[model samples]
Target: GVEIETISPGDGRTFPKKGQTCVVHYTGMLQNGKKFDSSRDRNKPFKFRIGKQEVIKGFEEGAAQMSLGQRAKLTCTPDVAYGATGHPGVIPPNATLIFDVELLNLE
Candidate 1:
């Protein structure tokens, strides 16, 4: 499971539901706080449908609970992340990941 720490609450009344598209801006980092990826670096939001396996499990889980305009920190253990076999050349093996995520839109 993902650990969600709200950075700032959203004004939206509801969270995104399954099958709905979620657009988010996120910065991913390793345990040592080394940056891995960021949507903001490119000035674009990453989009994926909820519960569709379009992203990692923890990320999907985290995104599902996010309301539009919500900003939160999602702490994902390796079990919910890449596990022992991390993404080659990027994430390390069994590395825990941290993501600063902002829900930009839902449709």
Candidate 2:
């Protein structure tokens, strides 16, 4: 399971269910303390439908437990990340990733 450490509690009472879209801002980091990706740099929240396999399994699973305006740290193991091969030219193989995420909205 992906480990979540809530940095700030959410304002909403409900969480996003499968098939609904979630909008979030996040910074993705590698085990080496280097940032690999970030939505904050783009100045826009990343949006995707939940449980659609659009994102990595660990991230998607963690996002499902979040509510609107929530900020949390997600610890993703290699199995739930890119797995043994990892993302080409980006993430290393069998890497454990970390994500600082803020739930912006949902639809």
Candidate 3:
């Protein structure tokens, strides 16, 4: 995955440290900008416990670089993303994923 770009640097300096529950809203798309999945459209935030195996590596990588409430955009290459075997229909194989992500809250 590429480096994270903070679109909306949210909240305090206190970031999600070590292992913690993280909540975020994200819009995921392919390189052509065709959206595949979006937490925004669904109006539901995704949650995961960092430092665990619950989420994708790129997803965790993207989230790890932010603080609570921060919004970011990340281009996740196949290497750190789903790679060759992507989620059928939702994500194509070797898909170059682009995600507009927001750090909603952490616990």
Candidate 4:
């Protein structure tokens, strides 16, 4: 029984410490729940250090409050996720995203 766990209160303002590396499993989706990417399918955890810009701004911010083995649903606006420019032809300008994430580790 896997359960999603967001930080208590869900204030939406947590920021990761600079240089902290986080590992997690994730599924990226649109507002309608149409999945775009998933680490569970890849069978490997994604890892990135904060402040390194290895991922989207929204991702870094959202992953900060997570604890090991916690799952969370992160809804990100275009301003924080992809911005107006977006990922070239992949994501359109001003598109929102939903990320289902499992926090594996932070170091």
Candidate 3 lowest-lDDT run of ten = 5-14
Better of 2 and 4 by TM-score: 2
> lDDT score, residue 85, model 1?
91
lDDT of 4 by residue, 30-76 (tens): 87646678888778787777777778877777776666656688878
lDDT measured at residue 105 in model 3 versus the true structure, 0 to 100: 79
lDDT of 4 at 15: 39
State in Å the error of residue 25, model 3: 0.9
Alpha-carbon lDDT of model 4: 0.71
Q: Pick the candidate with the highest TM-score.
A: 1
Model 3: how far is 72 from its true place, Å? 0.5
Off by over 4 Å in 1: none
Model 4 poorest ten-residue lDDT run: 1-10
* Residues 1-107 of candidate 2: C-alpha lDDT, one tens digit per residue: 68888877667577888678778888988876689899878987777887668888888888877788889899998887786987888887877899998887757
Q: Name the runs in model 3 displaced over 4 angstroms.
A: none
Q: State the weakest 10-residue window (summed lDDT) of model 2.
A: 7-16
TM values, all candidates: 0.91, 0.91, 0.86, 0.76
Backbone clash count for every predicted candidate, in the order shown: 0, 0, 0, 0
**Candidate 4 ranges with C-alpha deviation above 4 Å:** 1-17
**On a 0 to 100 scale, what is the lDDT of residue 30 in model 3?**
84
Model 1 Cα lDDT, one tens digit per residue, 1-107: 68888877677576888668778898988887678899987987877777667688888888776787789899998998898898998887888889999987856
